[PDB]
């Protein structure tokens, strides 16, 4: 029941050795990740559901469990998560499909 | 600077075939795409802008132009669509800069 | 010795929820499922093979995992599915022969 | 109306050059090609078929002229063709749809 | 004989743009760009050539005119670009030809 | 702390019987796979960091494993790896972030 607990700690381990021994690339990486998530004509909710549907089309666990986490604290509600994985399957078909299934296990998990 | 009204008009003519020959294809594929895009707890707008995302995050010119046609119709503004696009390129850099370049292109074809 | 079994199950406890809270999205996707994978110029067996091919060809063990499964309901022999693999492999390089090695798993998992 | 002849015979162009200065590459290449698609359980037709799947999936429209070619080299059937393309929606969604489009056009193109 | 040429121009049309109406965006990616191809323990030149084996794996064409038109500025050997190719071929198959194929126009546009 | 010597047994294991049941195909692959990888202009290290690269973007656990194991064999430093992977993340934004997380793992792990 701690899947996404223990691959999103586990990849942030690694980021802290990035962010010590790269810094000016991992500086670079933030700066842009602050850009494109701030609020703005849309809020950072709406933003971070785009970035879970990205996520899932891109079949990955680990951007899956991170975006998950920040929907938890922005308080996305299960049926817009639900209504965004929905988009990813008419984008994606059957792999999508399956993605959008560990959106929800690791959604649930951090809503715990 | 009718790039995209021909990519559409040209895919929207085998699809016309895809109908007549494929027609349980094409009405699965037609049910799944409504039910996706249907107005909920994420309006149609803000649906067509994460599927707007996702055609940039898979490099997909038809889909591009598609999306941003119905942008359009939905009367996204041209900030909602360069807040998505921002969040292409921070899941998916260079490449999703460059669809993101076409999705302008797009956005703004069909606008005229 | 049961990864793929889980790995289904798992996606399967997640399905059953989107059935019960998406039926319509649900609905719509097992349509196009149904008419894609319907017998006609192509025989099940076959267009089960060519889904095969495609979940290696996106990297995608859910679908590696339930296609083997349907694989061997259809009878599919082993050298059937080496022979879709070598497809994957000449379309995919590297990449795609780590993923034929997850198919021939699945397939010897599902087999016993 | 030359689309894909046009596409396939500058790509040809490029790679006759690749087996003059590569050699040892493009016979790698060719050996794993025919290893890949020569008959077996499956015939060259059903493997050509997976091949043009994969194109789709790949959004390859390189792959695509040239499957398309030999698809109608191999006598191919429009219907065989046909259902190959719906695997391909089934397993791919949205973006798959526009480069069975494509797939079409080609398979057209090629059986003038 | 000026495709590269024509596709790098379009986009970068666009890119400017994105300058004016995003401009932290755009300073995000560019510290982001500046940050991975500086010159470090990899000198410029081969972190571009492992630019152009990723944007072949991407198949994207705007990164590969403007890796391309890059290359030449610093002073890559067509042996170099060529065994690059290769990497690419080995881990991507048949669709990575086709785009290796487009590399190789690309250089020679952009070598005149 | 033997995550990818597990990933890469695993599939070793099934690439041997491959390499009894295929021989014709995992020949050609060989032929292909030694002759992108032979020292020229690049040598066999730097050939590697490309594998690397490719791996990440790619996002394929295999892929990384293998080419870890090889980079430490190769005598490739830290700081050539981690350039490596910055180049990946610029090419690829958040997912690559994640899986050259991965890769920093593997290349420590096989280092030990």
Same mark, same amino acid.
């Given at each position: 029941?701690?899947?996404?607990?223990?691959?999103?700690?586990?990849?942030?381990?690694?980021? +802290?050795?990035? /962010?010590?021994?790269? *810094?000016?690339?991992?500086?670079?990486?933030?700066?842009?990740?602050? @850009?494109?998530?701030?609020?703005? +004509?849309?809020?950072?909710?709406?933003?971070?559901?785009?970035? %879970?549907?990205? @996520?899932? @089309?891109?079949? #990955? *666990?680990? #951007?899956?469990?991170?975006?998950?986490?920040?929907?938890?604290?922005?308080?996305?509600? /299960? $049926?817009?998560?639900?209504?965004?994985?929905?988009?990813?399957?008419? %984008?994606?078909?059957? *792999?999508?499909? %399956?993605? +959008?299934?560990? +959106?929800?296990?690791?959604?649930? $998990?951090?809503?715990?």
């Amino acid at each position: 029941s701690d899947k996404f607990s223990h691959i999103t700690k586990d990849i942030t381990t690694q980021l +802290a050795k990035f /962010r010590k021994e790269m *810094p000016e690339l991992m500086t670079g990486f933030s700066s842009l990740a602050q @850009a494109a998530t701030k609020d703005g +004509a849309l809020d950072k909710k709406t933003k971070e559901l785009i970035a %879970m549907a990205l @996520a899932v @089309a891109k079949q #990955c *666990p680990g #951007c899956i469990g991170f975006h998950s986490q920040t929907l938890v604290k922005l308080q996305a509600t /299960r $049926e817009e998560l639900l209504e965004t994985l929905g988009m990813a399957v008419y %984008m994606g078909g059957g *792999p999508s499909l %399956m993605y +959008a299934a560990e +959106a929800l296990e690791a959604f649930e $998990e951090f809503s715990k």
